[PDB]
A and B are shown apart, each in its own frame.
Chain A
Amino acid sequence: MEINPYLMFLNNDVTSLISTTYPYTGPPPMSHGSSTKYTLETIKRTYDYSRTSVEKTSKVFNIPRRKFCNCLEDKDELVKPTGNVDISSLLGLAEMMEKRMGEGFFKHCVMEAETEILKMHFSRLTEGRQTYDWTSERNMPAATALQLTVDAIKETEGPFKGTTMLEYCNKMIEMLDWKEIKFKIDSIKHDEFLIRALTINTMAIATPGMIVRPFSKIVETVAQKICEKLKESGLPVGGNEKKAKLKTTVTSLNARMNSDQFAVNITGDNSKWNECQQPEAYLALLAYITKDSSDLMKDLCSVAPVLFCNKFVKLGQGIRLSNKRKTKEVIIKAEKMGKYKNLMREEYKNLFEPLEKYIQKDVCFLPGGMLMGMFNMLSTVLGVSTLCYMDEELKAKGCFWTGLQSSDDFVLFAVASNWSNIHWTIRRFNAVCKLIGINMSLEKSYGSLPELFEFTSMFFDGEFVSNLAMELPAFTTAGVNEGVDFTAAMSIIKTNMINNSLSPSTALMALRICLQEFRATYRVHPWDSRVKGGRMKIINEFIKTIENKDGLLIADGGKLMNNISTLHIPEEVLKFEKMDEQYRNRVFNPKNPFAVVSTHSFR
């Protein structure tokens, strides 16, 4: 006999079994090490996707500056990714979109974003995945680097009493001109501090510092206020709303065209969405946007772009040496690889000499591109602009298109009345996309009739819309308290159920699994169990003193009482009236040495 696990796709659909193809969600064990090799390949492919050779030495660094925008050359082999953008077509698409949506659209959105920012406290910047310290030269959460920056400002030129985003930004600006800066002790000069502020580290997802953070947040807020009004913008949210958008689009399409046309769908996957987005086009676009608004926003939105036009990239850990038998092994940093180039292999050599020009000490002056997972909203806006295109050449032929676009994934819907004009429309669309760097893959982008397609793992079909974005919590990595991590997980499971990524039995299984994970994390078990752990010792003696075992807390030899219909309700609220009054008051005693405010916190 032979067990071929795949023969169940014949007499069944795919929207029901595709989930079995991918492993379960979680932290992957792949752990790829960002090191010198990969970063240099990235920089090389970046400079190459620029199809030009022009340069202009600067005056603040005495370094060339590859200006790959509006200077397209090397037209040959245009199938591959391109990065040279044309400003005329960009502004034309922006004008088309404005005309469609309305005149005072960009103005209204920028005004809303402004007013929202005004009442904002700079402390918000503490809410971030991670950043890069410019003093310790490492990666840390936002709060740490923020405290470092503020205390350095204090130590050098007095405290920062603004307590607002705008004063923070102006303080950063002023600091760009300070000649000497101190920090706990040592100081630095102007050029070094500038570099450090424009430094980036590979986590090769980017990890910028703190100076540019607020301006990026502002630009993202504006782009978000914009993407909400757009029908074809599935980035800000997903699931129920996403399916609503899908079906609205499909129904409008079906009700739009006539009996003579026949439609088609396409599953597209933009390749190198980070190595072809240029901040110069973003700057020109933001300028065209704020053209009629307070000059304040005009200048503000023009900060992060230029900050990304000049971004030093921190090369990873340097190469290592070794003798033949490998009994001896030397270790060198990146800044000195230009000192031993005669030893490194060719493939590693040919990838290093052409860039030595742009190196200063240990970094590479990347003048463009967009590596961070930032400006995703803005890239999505640009894509939507691409999709809102229409002219008379198409109308004459009786064809058009439409669709939906995520950050770097999209779905197209072409329309025509012939099995050939569809090809012409597809080629027209690909050309207009490449005009501004937005490329497409060929080994990962397919298409077929309208019934079947895919978008953000939501494999749509004639029916049976199947999702695959099942998320889960993780206690060991994020340990907070024994009274929050369970409620948060319950809320998460509820959400996943809302998005249809989970079903009743699946949700119950996940709940009974997360409960055990929680217990094992905080090293707690019920009372029925015959365990001998430390926390259980006392619980193994002070347990007979109570009768409301149901009311007991999970953190204290308790048992579960919540279920599907009782997730929004924390176990505490569900056991309050049931906990023996003694234990109850013993928990809710604000006179203790230490969401629901319990006597279970781990400060």
Chain B
Amino acid sequence: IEMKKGKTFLELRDESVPLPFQTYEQMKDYCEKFKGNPRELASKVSQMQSNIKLPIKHYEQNKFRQIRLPKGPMAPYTHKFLMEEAWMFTKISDPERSRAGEILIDFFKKGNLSAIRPKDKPLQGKYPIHYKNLWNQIKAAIADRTMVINENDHSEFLGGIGRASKKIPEISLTQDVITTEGLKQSENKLPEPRSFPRWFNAEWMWAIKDSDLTGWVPMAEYPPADNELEDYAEHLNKTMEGVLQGTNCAREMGKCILTVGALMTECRLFPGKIKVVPIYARSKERKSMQEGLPVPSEMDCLFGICVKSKSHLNKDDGMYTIITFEFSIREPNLEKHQKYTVFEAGHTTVRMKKGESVIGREVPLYLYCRTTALSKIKNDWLSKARRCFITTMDTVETICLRESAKAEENLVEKTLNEKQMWIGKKNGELIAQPLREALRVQLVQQFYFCIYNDSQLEGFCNEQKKILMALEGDKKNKSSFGFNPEGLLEKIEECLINNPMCLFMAQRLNELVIEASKRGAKFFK
């Protein structure tokens, strides 16, 4: 028995071999009889150690430096929807009409949408007429009880503005044709570099706040229990869900979930067609106007509408396009709102408590228009937003066992209610809150990671780890040593082009090392 040999294989084997050997047999004999001469090997490695000129540092005599950010205009808003400047109409939830096609029609019946009549001239925008005619067509379609749009003039345009052209076969090509058309390779456009955003902090603060309504995110049930572990597991989960569900970030999470759940189905059952889809969310309880306690209130909310272009999700890496019509009661700013075309759509009403009754105060109303693309992978990534709860729950639990083990007793409630965590600086002084209140910051961080996910963020997060470990070593009086820090600084500065988060987690990393210098000796000023 043996592997019967061919010919071409043997020729290759005898060909592909090291330099001094030209046949498999010579190399084989040299190998099977190789003997050890550690002296020549030591001389060779010493010679290499001579020609090599490795640089080794200690971070003390040659410290790090602050990062040099790009320069230019501010980084604009990037997410698809609106978080802080949003607005929503409300209505009662019917389990018999719990679908987008029905919820949208119901919202339209009372005629609050038909009252939305944006004027011709906008405040800041590019293609206002297309958006306006498209909004009229959307209202017409909803009136017809069909979400479809027959005419394809505006959607087609706004979907083709990115790229649309003819194509000539290579076989029909000559030199005179080329010289006539001036054909040349298609110069790739490299993304431009932006400055530090001055609105991230406001959005973060707003997200940390508590929403009037609650129950934005749906969850499964809780199985039975058979011992103290599962009970204690149930206890932590309930409290943590107690705190995070009431936050404005949960609202955006539920909105993304319920909107993507409809878009992923529309791109499946009506491909190559133009459909209409709402931007809605569902709540289950609020807080009394007379009492700060929860109250059952099942309700639906509509933030805006999203139109769909032709989407097959089997070509062009499954790229498709949409168009957003969101509502707002806050005039825009020119910097943050650059990709948005804005209008003024009449007025609306706001409702607030007045003693033991409710009143209504009329306010203006704005309409935010924007175009953007998506894909199948982005849908699968957004639909799975809940996993953010998994990570925040996990960071809460690492802090409630480590301590519980140092003292060898249950300290869960004690640490949650007492353990203070630095959150920020106000008036040149630190601010601290309990863990029960920093869960919000952790969750918002994870969410923003889930939104602005991109290669830039991957590199940033993969690189900052080294700085963090160096800092930790500094704290505990350990002579951390490296080889080329400036190269790492460059690796990190090259992946800061235009991802709002990456630019604003860099400015914030700079500021962690300017405060620690007061107790560390490995960083410049």
Residue of A nearest to B264 (CB): A476
Residues in B with CB closer than 8 Å to A291 are 31-32
Q: Contact at B465–A18, with CB atoms within 8 Å?
A: yes
Q: Does B395 contact A (CB under 8 A)?
A: yes
Residues in A with CB closer than 8 Å to B421 are 8
Q: Contact at B16–A367, with CB atoms within 8 Å?
A: yes
Q: Contact at B2–A446, with CB atoms within 8 Å?
A: no
Q: Does B98 contact A (CB under 8 A)?
A: yes
* Bound: A243/B57 CA distance, A: 30
Known: A9-B471, A75-B51, A324-B182. Is A446-B478 also a contact (CB below 8 A)?
A: no
Q: Contact at B515–A7, with CB atoms within 8 Å?
A: yes
Q: Contact at B224–A561, with CB atoms within 8 Å?
A: yes
Q: Contact at A302–B13, with CB atoms within 8 Å?
A: yes
Stretch at the interface among B145-153, B279-287, B376-384: B376-384
CB distance from B263 to the nearest CB of A (A): 14
CB distance from B265 to the nearest CB of A (A): 10
* Bound: A448/B478 CA distance, A: 7
Q: Contact at A288–B34, with CB atoms within 8 Å?
A: yes
Q: Does B359 contact A (CB under 8 A)?
A: no
CB distance from A49 to the nearest CB of B (A): 16
Stretch at the interface among A127-135, A402-410, A510-518, A576-584: A510-518
Binary contact track B467-496/A, C-beta < 8 Å → 1, others 0: 011111101101111111001101100000
Q: Does B89 contact A (CB under 8 A)?
A: no
Known: A169-B3, A504-B233. Is A9-B512 also a contact (CB below 8 A)?
A: yes
CB distance from B123 to the nearest CB of A (A): 30
Q: Contact at B20–A70, with CB atoms within 8 Å?
A: yes
Residue from A24, A280, A531 having most chain B Cβ neighbours under 10 A = A24
Residues in B with CB closer than 8 Å to A29 are 375, 377-378, 381, 453-454
Q: Does B391 contact A (CB under 8 A)?
A: yes
CB distance from B164 to the nearest CB of A (A): 9
Q: Does A5 contact B (CB under 8 A)?
A: yes
Binary contact track A464-478/B, C-beta < 8 Å → 1, others 0: 101000001000100
Q: Contact at A328–B19, with CB atoms within 8 Å?
A: no
Q: Contact at A11–B165, with CB atoms within 8 Å?
A: no
Residues in A with CB closer than 8 Å to B446 are 20, 23-24
Q: Contact at A287–B44, with CB atoms within 8 Å?
A: no
Stretch at the interface among A233-241, A354-362, A431-439, A541-549: A431-439
Residues in A with CB closer than 8 Å to B462 are 22
Q: Contact at B391–A287, with CB atoms within 8 Å?
A: no
Q: Contact at A431–B512, with CB atoms within 8 Å?
A: no
Residues in A with CB closer than 8 Å to B466 are 444, 446
Residues in A with CB closer than 8 Å to B20 are 70
Q: Does B398 contact A (CB under 8 A)?
A: yes
A residues lining the B interface (CB < 8 Å): 1-11, 13-14, 16-33, 54, 58-60, 65, 67, 69-71, 75, 78-79, 86-89, 91-92, 95-96, 166, 169-170, 173-174, 176-177, 194, 267, 279-280, 283-284, 287-288, 291-292, 295-296, 299-300, 302-303, 305-306, 309-310, 319-324, 326-333, 336, 343-345, 348, 367, 391-393, 423-424, 426-428, 430-432, 434-435, 442-449, 451-452, 454, 464, 466, 472, 476, 502-506, 508-510, 512-513, 515-517, 520, 530-532, 559-565
CB distance from B312 to the nearest CB of A (A): 16
Residues in B with CB closer than 8 Å to A517 are 384
Interchain pairs with CB closer than 8 A, number? 423
Stretch at the interface among B35-43, B127-135, B303-311: B35-43
CB distance from A318 to the nearest CB of B (A): 9
* Bound: A563/B234 CA distance, A: 11
Q: Contact at B229–A564, with CB atoms within 8 Å?
A: yes
Known: A296-B3, A508-B237. Is A20-B395 also a contact (CB below 8 A)?
A: yes
Q: Contact at B469–A454, with CB atoms within 8 Å?
A: yes
Residues in B with CB closer than 8 Å to A11 are 422
Known: A20-B442, A59-B11, A428-B45. Is A4-B512 also a contact (CB below 8 A)?
A: yes
Q: Contact at B11–A9, with CB atoms within 8 Å?
A: no
Residues in B with CB closer than 8 Å to A560 are 220-221, 223
CB distance from A358 to the nearest CB of B (A): 15
Q: Contact at A563–B401, with CB atoms within 8 Å?
A: no
Stretch at the interface among B65-73, B166-174, B321-329, B350-358: B166-174
CB distance from A332 to the nearest CB of B (A): 5
Residue from A58, A69, A300, A508 having most chain B Cβ neighbours under 10 A = A508
Q: Contact at A506–B18, with CB atoms within 8 Å?
A: no
Q: Contact at A280–B17, with CB atoms within 8 Å?
A: yes
Which residue of the partner chain, among A9, A58, A445, A565, contacts B468 with CB atoms under 8 Å?
A9
**27 residue pairs from A and B, CB less than 8 Å apart:** A2-B425, A2-B426, A6-B511, A7-B430, A9-B512, A19-B398, A22-B462, A25-B387, A65-B15, A79-B52, A86-B44, A92-B37, A280-B18, A287-B28, A299-B3, A322-B186, A330-B173, A428-B49, A430-B49, A431-B52, A442-B484, A443-B488, A444-B488, A451-B478, A452-B478, A530-B96, A564-B230
Known: A14-B472, A306-B9, A563-B226. 19 other contacts (CB 8 A): A2-B426, A5-B441, A21-B461, A29-B377, A65-B16, A69-B18, A70-B20, A79-B54, A87-B30, A267-B469, A320-B186, A321-B184, A323-B181, A323-B182, A330-B168, A427-B54, A446-B470, A476-B380, A565-B229
CB distance from B193 to the nearest CB of A (A): 20
Residues in B with CB closer than 8 Å to A58 are 15
Q: Contact at B391–A19, with CB atoms within 8 Å?
A: yes
Q: Contact at B41–A345, with CB atoms within 8 Å?
A: no
CB distance from A574 to the nearest CB of B (A): 10
Residue of B nearest to A476 (CB): B380
Residue from B38, B163, B509 having most chain A Cβ neighbours under 10 A = B38
Which residue of the partner chain, among B230, B422, B442, contacts A10 with CB atoms under 8 Å?
B422
Q: Contact at B52–A509, with CB atoms within 8 Å?
A: no
Q: Does B82 contact A (CB under 8 A)?
A: no
Q: Contact at A1–B426, with CB atoms within 8 Å?
A: yes
* Bound: A348/B185 CA distance, A: 9
Q: Contact at B27–A284, with CB atoms within 8 Å?
A: yes
Residues in A with CB closer than 8 Å to B184 are 321-322, 343
* B 221-273 contacts with A by CB, 8 A: 221-227, 229-230, 232-234, 236-237, 240, 261
Residues in A with CB closer than 8 Å to B186 are 319-322, 326, 329
* Bound: A292/B237 CA distance, A: 61
Residues in B with CB closer than 8 Å to A563 are 223-226, 230
CB distance from B172 to the nearest CB of A (A): 9
Q: Contact at B223–A21, with CB atoms within 8 Å?
A: no
Q: Contact at A174–B237, with CB atoms within 8 Å?
A: no
Residues in B with CB closer than 8 Å to A449 are 473, 478-479
Known: A1-B426, A29-B454. Is A319-B465 also a contact (CB below 8 A)?
A: no
Stretch at the interface among B109-117, B200-208, B289-297, B335-343: B200-208
* Bound: A65/B15 CA distance, A: 10
* Bound: A323/B166 CA distance, A: 11
Q: Contact at A328–B445, with CB atoms within 8 Å?
A: no
Residues in A with CB closer than 8 Å to B201 are 1-3
Q: Contact at B36–A464, with CB atoms within 8 Å?
A: no
Known: A3-B441, A6-B512, A14-B472. Is A427-B52 also a contact (CB below 8 A)?
A: yes
Q: Contact at B167–A329, with CB atoms within 8 Å?
A: yes
CB distance from A280 to the nearest CB of B (A): 6
Q: Contact at B390–A510, with CB atoms within 8 Å?
A: yes
Q: Contact at B167–A331, with CB atoms within 8 Å?
A: yes
Binary contact track B384-421/A, C-beta < 8 Å → 1, others 0: 10111111011111110110000000000000000001
Residues in B with CB closer than 8 Å to A532 are 96, 98-99
* Bound: A317/B223 CA distance, A: 52
Q: Does B187 contact A (CB under 8 A)?
A: yes
Which residue of the partner chain, among A4, A14, A194, contacts B425 with CB atoms under 8 Å?
A4
Q: Contact at B381–A26, with CB atoms within 8 Å?
A: yes
Residue of B nearest to A291 (CB): B32
Residues in A with CB closer than 8 Å to B472 are 9, 13-14, 452
Known: A5-B441, A30-B455, A88-B34. Is A166-B3 also a contact (CB below 8 A)?
A: yes
Q: Contact at B237–A306, with CB atoms within 8 Å?
A: no
Residue of A nearest to B426 (CB): A1
CB distance from B446 to the nearest CB of A (A): 7
